[PDB]
């Protein structure tokens, strides 16, 4: 009997004032939250933000919407959401969000006989996440999502995670290319501004960066060029054109690699680990070039001393490079 | 009782003309402003602007909205803001702005018994900031936000910072990697256009650029290449291949640095400090190469003169480079 359902729904929305919260003038209305994380698409060091898609569900109670004589949950057309009171929930650290609207607005309204309202949205949000890149690419980050009421203070509304630590689902399915999600945490607290105290829910993830891409992409070319630079020490000192060609080629390749690396990061004012390694390699190749320049300078009158310098450089450079690598990989791991 | 408040608000909005400002036809209405800065996402020299996110709060008194019998302040659902008069405040130097709208429009309306309205918005605006880059990267910028009334002249409306020096908070939340905030300033004034005089608030920040990255990545390579270019003065002039290789390498490396580094800024017509420094280093290395060319040209008929020229160049070039550096760093610091 759809006519009785229609009459009941018309009666529920008769004289209903959406300007007033449930239990207006009385105790705060409690709103429970749930989130299903569909995906975490892109994490950007350049923009210091991440994108996240989720199903966001709010549960509350509105005694003006209690009905009797119909033993069913009432799933209503989402446009009814424009005729009801809903919480003014927002995300504090977001930069650009939207609700999906194909084929219709991705919104759900479900009434229960006792007056309980379930209100669901599907949201894609970009959110700010400040990152500490001092140990990049061996770094670990903590990215949060902050959920707050905008207009209502703690005297009007209260938030709580519905189900405790089970209120956020789908985190274990997330696969990220550059990161892995070590842990996620849920917090509830109060925040005081000049206009009063407001409820706050926090959902935080800890991300650890995978190292394999940087081993394959930047560390190996630098190591291989540095090793290539040592072949000069095994060439006779009278082949001036070859060894000068080696020095020039190695310096040019170092500059090209450095530019291609730095063209992908923000202009931070401190030294990163990869910067330290690359300038170590540059120092090594420059020292090899200067050593050859010295040997070529003094070899005309003292060939034996030049040969001795080359022979000792055959040994010293690998040893010092191994020591530098040991120190670097012990300071960062 | 919810029905009593419902009928009170219905009486308040009955006969309310939204087309008329408070005290229309009488004394001007005073609007107090507050700004809570959440972040400055980015500052772009290429686009000559910066992105700011803030809570913008406006305070005024509308006697038509006064109510009695309820000793409470009514925090209303923000949709009621579509039925009230609000100031036509705009930002003159903004280029693209939006109010955040997830999960609902980030808007707040609070009424007080005597008729005071508090109206809050969460706004992200990209505002223009014309930059003088003559001292770049040692430059200091001043970026402003201009708040004005569009339609109402000084006869209709007045603006003032509510709280004086404390009207803007959250300045310590501004975290820019490439800048630091030195000072912020609040200004109130009037601006005359051909349609009349309008109130104007101004919020300005002074940004100081951090020099560490440019010291690390630009100045040191030029200094090191100039010093390497000085090694030719200490080499005997019979080593034509070695000295020619040194000069060519220094010249080409300077050109490569300039081409691969300067191509990253707006096409300003004037010369920046870093441009003048790089051109000075290029001039020095080119003059060293030209000096060697002349010495090689003349040394077969006047060896003593060539030796004297090299001996004096050894002393003169470092001295003039030190003088150039002293003048540059005194002028720009």
């Amino acid at each position: 009997n759809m006519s009785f359902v229609k009459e009941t729904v018309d009666k529920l929305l008769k004289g209903y004032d959406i300007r007033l919260r449930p239990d207006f003038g009385g105790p705060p209305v409690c709103v429970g939250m749930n989130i299903d994380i569909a995906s975490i698409d892109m994490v950007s060091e350049v923009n210091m933000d991440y994108t996240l898609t989720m199903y966001f569900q709010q549960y509350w109670r509105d005694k003006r919407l209690a009905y009797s004589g119909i033993p069913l949950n009432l799933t209503l057309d989402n446009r009814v959401a424009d005729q009801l009171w809903v919480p003014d929930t927002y995300f504090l650290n977001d930069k650009k969000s939207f609700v999906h609207g194909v084929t219709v607005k991705n919104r759900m309204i479900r009434l229960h006989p006792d007056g309980t309202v379930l209100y669901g949205l599907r949201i894609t949000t970009t959110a700010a996440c400040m990152m500490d890149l001092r140990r990049y690419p061996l770094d670990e980050q903590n990215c949060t999502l902050e959920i707050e009421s905008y207009g209502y203070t703690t005297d009007d509304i209260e938030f709580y995670w519905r189900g405790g630590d089970k209120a956020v689902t789908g985190v274990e399915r997330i696969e990220l290319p550059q990161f892995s999600i070590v842990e996620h945490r849920l917090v509830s607290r109060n925040v005081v501004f000049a206009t009063g105290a407001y409820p706050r829910l926090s959902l935080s993830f800890r991300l650890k960066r995978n190292i394999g891409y940087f081993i394959l992409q930047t560390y190996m070319p630098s190591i291989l060029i540095t090793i290539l630079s040592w072949v000069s020490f095994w060439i006779n000192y009278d082949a001036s054109a070859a060894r000068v060609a080696l020095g020039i080629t190695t310096v040019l390749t170092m500059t090209t690699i450095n530019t291609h690396l730095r063209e992908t990061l923000p202009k931070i004012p401190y030294v990163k680990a990869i910067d330290m390694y690359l300038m170590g390699c540059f120092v090594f190749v420059f020292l090899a070039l200067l050593e050859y320049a010295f040997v070529n300078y003094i070899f005309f009158s003292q060939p034996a001393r030049a040969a001795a310098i080359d022979r000792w450089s055959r040994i010293v450079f690998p040893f010092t490079f191994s020591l530098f690598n040991l120190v670097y990989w012990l300071y960062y791991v | 009782n919810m029905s009593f408040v419902k009928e009170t608000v219905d009486k308040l909005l009955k006969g309310y003309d939204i087309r008329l400002r408070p005290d229309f036809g009488g004394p001007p209405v005073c609007v107090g402003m507050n700004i809570d800065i959440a972040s400055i996402d980015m500052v772009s020299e290429v686009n000559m602007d910066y992105t700011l996110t803030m809570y913008f709060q406006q305070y005024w008194r509308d006697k038509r909205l006064a109510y009695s019998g309820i000793p409470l302040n009514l925090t209303l659902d923000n949709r009621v803001a579509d039925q009230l008069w609000v100031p036509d405040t705009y930002f003159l130097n903004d280029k693209k702005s939006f109010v955040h709208g997830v999960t609902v429009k980030n808007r707040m309306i609070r009424l007080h018994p005597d008729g005071t309205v508090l109206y809050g918005l969460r706004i992200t605006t990209t505002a223009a900031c014309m930059m003088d880059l003559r001292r770049y990267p040692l430059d200091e910028q001043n970026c402003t936000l201009e708040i004005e009334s569009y339609g109402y002249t000084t006869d209709d409306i007045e603006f003032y910072w509510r709280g004086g020096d404390k009207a803007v908070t959250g300045v310590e939340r501004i975290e820019l990697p490439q800048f630091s905030i030195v000072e912020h300033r609040l200004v109130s004034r009037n601006v005359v256009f051909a349609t009349g005089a309008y109130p104007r608030l101004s919020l300005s920040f002074r940004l100081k650029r951090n020099i560490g990255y440019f010291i690390l990545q630009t100045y040191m390579p030029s200094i090191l290449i100039t010093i390497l270019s000085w090694v030719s003065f200490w080499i005997n002039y019979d080593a034509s291949a070695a000295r020619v290789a040194l000069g060519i390498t220094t010249v080409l490396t300077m050109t490569t640095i300039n081409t691969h580094l300067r191509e990253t800024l707006p096409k300003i017509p004037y010369v920046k400090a870093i441009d003048m420094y790089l051109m000075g280093c290029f001039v020095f290395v080119f003059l060293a190469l030209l000096e060697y060319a002349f010495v090689n040209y003349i040394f077969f008929s006047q060896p003593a003169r060539a030796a004297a020229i090299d001996r004096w160049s050894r002393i003169v070039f470092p001295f003039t480079f030190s003088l150039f550096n002293l003048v540059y760093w005194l002028y720009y610091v």
Partner: nanobody
Amino acid sequence: LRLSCAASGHTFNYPIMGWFRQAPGKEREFVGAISWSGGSTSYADSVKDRFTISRDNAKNTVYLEMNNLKPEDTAVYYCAAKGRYSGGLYYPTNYDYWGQGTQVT
């Protein structure tokens, strides 16, 4: 007189340090706040131009220098850390990690 607050651990997640003082009969009172990186200080009215706050990241320390003391500056002093999205700068509820109380007469 000079008070030093040295912080260790995850100082990146708590980029703001604040100073408070508790009187024997009054509640906790905000004194000043300092940003670890930006070095942008903020002060309460009662200690403007008299107290100064400085930060050094070398050993992660913040210094409160107190000058021109008064008998109304006899309170137990605390240092605290504030989260990145913790709200207003003047409210003790918004500060998570509190140091040990220090007495000044």
